[PDB]
Assembly symmetry: C3
Homo-oligomer: 104 residues x 3
């Protein structure tokens, strides 16, 4: 996996958003935590009509430009089950990151 | 018709359309999208602020589809009364399918 | 610094912080005049031992000129000074459409 970030010259940070099967959540969290990635935020979400709404898990992680490929690979590998419906990972550009405790 | 200004994002191939609207209109918006052949909707209940329940729906679509999809959502969520909500269009740098590793 | 996004008019401020600070952040923003806040409960991560911790997410879309002031107000209101106060992210937005009117931009 190699993400093309060429449309965002100068962008230092990106958000990795993964939407995947709920039962894989602990596996993804464990992988990321063991690799030293922090800042995970998890939201339960739903992903034909409303009857076809099923539970999914959303995980967002902000990383630096140079980290994107490695982190996407970790997430994909742990969310993977080899079957249709495994979900998708989206990479979004971020303009600024501010830590509340130390902000001006 | 609605024409979204994507001019500040040249070379961006995918965009996320995020709609925040009345919860009772969820089935109508979903049906409209399904009929047009959209897949991959994510829905989150959220609150607006006097905190009021709203429904959020996100869809990632190709650049060429943005206007058509924005129009469809706008149309189906519309009532004309104050509080109908908003649609935001966001740039997406990459899309990766978990099962295949394809980008 | 927003200089990697020339041409972008609107930005989304996303704050992820302690739930007990939520009423304070809302009041601060309201009194200041900010409208259009959206709030979502989310979970942070604190096999191997990890723990999901409740957080509040607040999103506000503002004009480029309003970004610094709004980020400051949110930081000030969400702060406690202890480890675990959370983060504020600023994201570029391409378009804003008001459903009632089909108005875009502003």
């Amino acid at each position: 996996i190699q993400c093309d970030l060429s449309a965002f010259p100068g962008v230092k940070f990106f958000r990795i958003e993964a939407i995947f099967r709920p039962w894989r959540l602990p596996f993804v969290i464990d992988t990321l935590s063991k690799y030293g990635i922090r800042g995970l935020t998890n939201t339960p979400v739903k992903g034909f009509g409303p009857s076809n709404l099923v539970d999914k898990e959303k995980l967002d992680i902000v990383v630096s430009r140079a980290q994107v490929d490695a982190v996407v690979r970790l997430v994909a590998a742990s969310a993977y089950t080899g079957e249709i419906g495994d979900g998708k990972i989206f990479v979004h550009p971020v303009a600024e990151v501010v830590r509340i405790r130390t902000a001006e």
